[PDB]
Design a protein around this ligand. Structure first.
Ligand code: ADP
Ligand code: ADP
Lengths: 514, 23, 459
């Protein structure tokens, strides 16, 4: 491996490269300044990011001796053996030449010395502390660590002289660079565009890209060997990569019908900050984040959220309202914090909170254990949405069918500033057209007549009618005919009543008057 | 002639924890 | 299909390495073999080792220990890399890989030795296992083991028979097709034990191998339209979807044999089956339904027979309590883990109930579970004749009187009637035996009509 085999982690890679190589390339500089260089690095990030690859690349680029120590491997049940293993490893590393020690997964062998109960763990922790710092501890040898959760480590280990430097190894350009470097040794094709790959694989850590490329290359030969100069004109195409991706929703601005102004507003407010950061920096202002949808159920709020999430390269984390509450003390707030930490850990990201009426509930006062739980959940949500944060890129999108039961602290501007109302036959025509995109249609059917007889149906009702028509067509087979629609139209539901429509109209009128 | 040696290192125990329910 | 897959995976990266290099993909190098025991994974390994003149360094699981297990692993890998592009067979990997949550050292050695294979090595590894769950995901990571096969018959059984018994002075009146047909669940070694016990019984016969030796060696070893549409409908749904492409669930309700019909599905449908009771699955109460449906979607196709649906759904509505909150979370988990089933993974949920009133209309909706099968004298006669199959019945007895007298009953209480008759006959037999303490082998060898007429009193 080499420095050219690393992409995306440009700044941290450069920092580690200089801090490791400057002592090695020439120690005269540090002799002149009269200060010893740092001799420890704690890498942290999700698994499969390239941290051990970076350590190996640095060790290869320099005259070092990469020695790998695994966490679970060195720990044993025998008394006074794991400590002997660590001592032997350090003696070996220091014996031959100035080297790099990469001890992987230290969190398994650093349980904070308070939450642990096994004496071997504390003993190996103390051995590590003595080896890293003490009388003639280290003589021209550096240690590198790796973990997923850096919090579960001894404070004594995160000190200067042991792990004085902490590096965060967590984007589009880095992903494209990894795609380029992972396909350098194979002639794939002439019409394969990497922009779609860098935009579609928006949730890949970086070690999954190698697996994706290998899988596509293997499947290309798997599909090109059933029947079989053969070596000529070999390589992967777009189809193989698409199949590899198939082996996180499938919508693009088409499955939604009507609501043109709402579509345009969402598209602008979501795409402007992502496409033009330079313009906002020039204007020196942040973008709006929050949007709330309210109206009758089954209107397409989830569909709209998916459709505005898909065009950008952002992730999508959808969570139901009551899908987080727990009977325990502090579990719901822990779940909320984990959700938001994940959301802001992969920027950009759009979070779709469904059924806010279940979470917010207009806390007020209830005088009960459920009341206290709701109060704590609401306060945690308020702090996470707008509190002591950085708000790099997070787009919280709300969706409820009873906005009257929401406290006026989440509807506040800066959290859910946009109060969008989601409410016709012309719209129903577009809905039917978008639903019947890939279907064998009859020239004799008139969708206008079908839409004319709705008079207050929802998109769920239209999908139900389409499903009944498809069931009738499959029953006949075992194109869609008009009599299936004729017989399916009589069995309408119209699940949405009239009083709730009056309530929504009153709420919209009050909001407009406000 | 050969010789034997004794060795007794450790074992593994199980703990019990208490939880709090918020109804 | 599995033989063609493993034949491609052992021929194409081993005979045309240059073509493999030309594609620019260097991943195929590790193959895993899981499945139930007695299916032929070791037989496929022996066939691979005897179809190629390449080197074959077999290393079993617990034969690696004696710091010399690492030396043995390095010795085997350098021996397989030094000689030729070849194949290594590691049988019973569950002893070497203990799922990790000197074993840690040998697992780390196998990890760093499987990863350190370059393009000029050109060796692949094959590994067989019994259980598919106690394997490291670090061993199942991308780079070592990614292409696993799922080896899940009478022709192969006839082949194994013709392989084993062709080295003996056998007989002149044998038909091995009957021995391959009547033997159902044997695999590999049990047929060898069958031939060995046949030889032992022949030696026992000629001391004080014909067909009869093999015969008792095998014997001494180890609602018509409703069922037609239900079986026919299930078959059509799980059949080819090309007709469907050009163009899952069910519910029983009634007063009759619904769980009996689910048992008949579970035996004779040629598909998988996973069943749970009603309140058996009560964050852990949602995690139970989540990993039950994960086990369902992993073994596609399958049938998830949810017995006694009312107890689970309860028509969530408003209850306003801890039980109400648990019911709402259970109903939401079931709905959000059933509506996410596409045409892929083809699971099928079968429900049955006594009270159809208390089921949730949110679960009786179209698009999730729309069918409604409503569930007699002839079926009652068939149930009584099927329960009394392996029973020494009295010859002067008709069951049409029990069929005509019992109208709104069910199969479980019919079983209760037969069991009470057996209990009364056993009481009569033990009373006659203690009174005798000579009559025949049994003073009451068959169940008379008096036992049925006394057992139906408390039915
Ligand atoms: N930034 C990167 N550049 C090139 N390859 C990468 C990068 N990140 C991950 N990989 C690939 O992922 C594979 C394993 O990643 P690794 O670094 O072991 O994961 P982890 O970060 O958990 O240690 C390597 O073979 C490497 O090719
Ligand atoms: N305007 C629309 N165009 C196309 N499909 C729609 C529309 N509105 C609703 N649907 C369909 O009806 C269903 C609505 O579900 P969902 O939007 O999740 O409920 P809610 O509207 O209460 O959030 C979706 O599966 C969607 O396909």
């Amino acid at each position: 491996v080499g420095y050219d085999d690393i992409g995306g982690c440009r700044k941290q890679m450069a920092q580690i490269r200089e801090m490791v190589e400057l002592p090695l390339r020439h120690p005269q500089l540090f002799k002149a300044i009269g200060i010893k260089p740092p001799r420890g690095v704690l890498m942290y990030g999700p698994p499969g990011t390239g941290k051990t690859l970076m350590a190996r690349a640095v060790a290869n680029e320099t005259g070092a001796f990469f020695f790998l120590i695994n966490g679970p491997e060195v720990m044993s049940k025998m008394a006074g053996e794991s400590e002997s293993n660590l001592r032997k490893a350090f003696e070996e590393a220091e014996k031959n030449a100035p080297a790099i020690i990469f001890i992987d997964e230290i969190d398994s062998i650093a349980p904070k010395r308070d939450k642990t109960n096994g004496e071997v763990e504390r003993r190996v922790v103390s051995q590590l502390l003595t080896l890293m710092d003490g009388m003639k501890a280290r003589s021209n040898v550096v240690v590198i660590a790796a973990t997923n959760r850096p919090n579960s480590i001894d404070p004594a280990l995160r000190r200067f002289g042991r792990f004085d430097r902490e590096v965060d190894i967590g984007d589009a350009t880095g992903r494209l660079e990894v795609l380029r470097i992972h396909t350098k040794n194979m002639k794939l094709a002439d019409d394969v565009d990497l922009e779609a790959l860098a935009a579609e694989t928006h949730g890949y850590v970086g070690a999954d890209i190698a697996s994706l490329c290998s899988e596509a290359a293997m499947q290309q030969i798997r599909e090109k060997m059933d029947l079989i100069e053969v070596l000529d004109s070999l390589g992967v195409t777009m189809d193989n990569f698409r199949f590899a991706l198939g082996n996180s929703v499938n919508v693009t601005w088409d499955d939604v019908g009507g609501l043109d102004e709402i579509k345009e507003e969402l598209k602008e407010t979501v795409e402007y900050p992502v496409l033009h950061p330079d313009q906002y920096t020039k204007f020196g202002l942040s973008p709006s984040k929050g949007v709330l949808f309210y109206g009758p159920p089954g209107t397409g709020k989830t569909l709209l959220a998916k459709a505005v999430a898909t065009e950008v390269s952002a992730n999508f984390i959808s969570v139901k309202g009551p899908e987080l509450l727990s009977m325990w003390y502090g579990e719901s707030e822990s779940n909320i914090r984990d959700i938001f930490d994940k959301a802001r850990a992969a920027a950009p990201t759009v979070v779709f909170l469904d059924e806010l009426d279940s979470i917010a509930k207009a806390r007020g006062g209830s005088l009960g254990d459920a009341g206290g739980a709701s109060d704590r959940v609401v306060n945690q949500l308020l702090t996470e949405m707008d509190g002591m944060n950085a708000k790099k890129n997070v787009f919280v999108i709300g969706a409820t069918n009873r906005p009257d039961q929401i406290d006026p602290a989440i509807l506040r501007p800066g959290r859910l500033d946009q109060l969008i109302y989601v409410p016709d036959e012309n719209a129903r025509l577009s809905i039917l057209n978008a639903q019947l995109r890939k279907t064998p249609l009859e020239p004799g059917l008139e969708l206008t007549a079908i839409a004319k007889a709705t008079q207050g149906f929802s998109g769920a009702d239209l999908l139900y009618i389409v499903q009944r028509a498809a069931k009738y067509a499959i029953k006949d087979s075992i194109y869609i005919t008009k009599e299936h629609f004729a017989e399916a139209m009589k069995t309408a539901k119209r699940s949405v009543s009239d009083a709730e429509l009056r309530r929504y109209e009153a709420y919209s009128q009050q909001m407009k008057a406000s | 002639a050969a010789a034997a040696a004794a060795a007794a290192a450790a074992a593994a125990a199980v703990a019990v924890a208490v939880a709090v329910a918020a109804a």
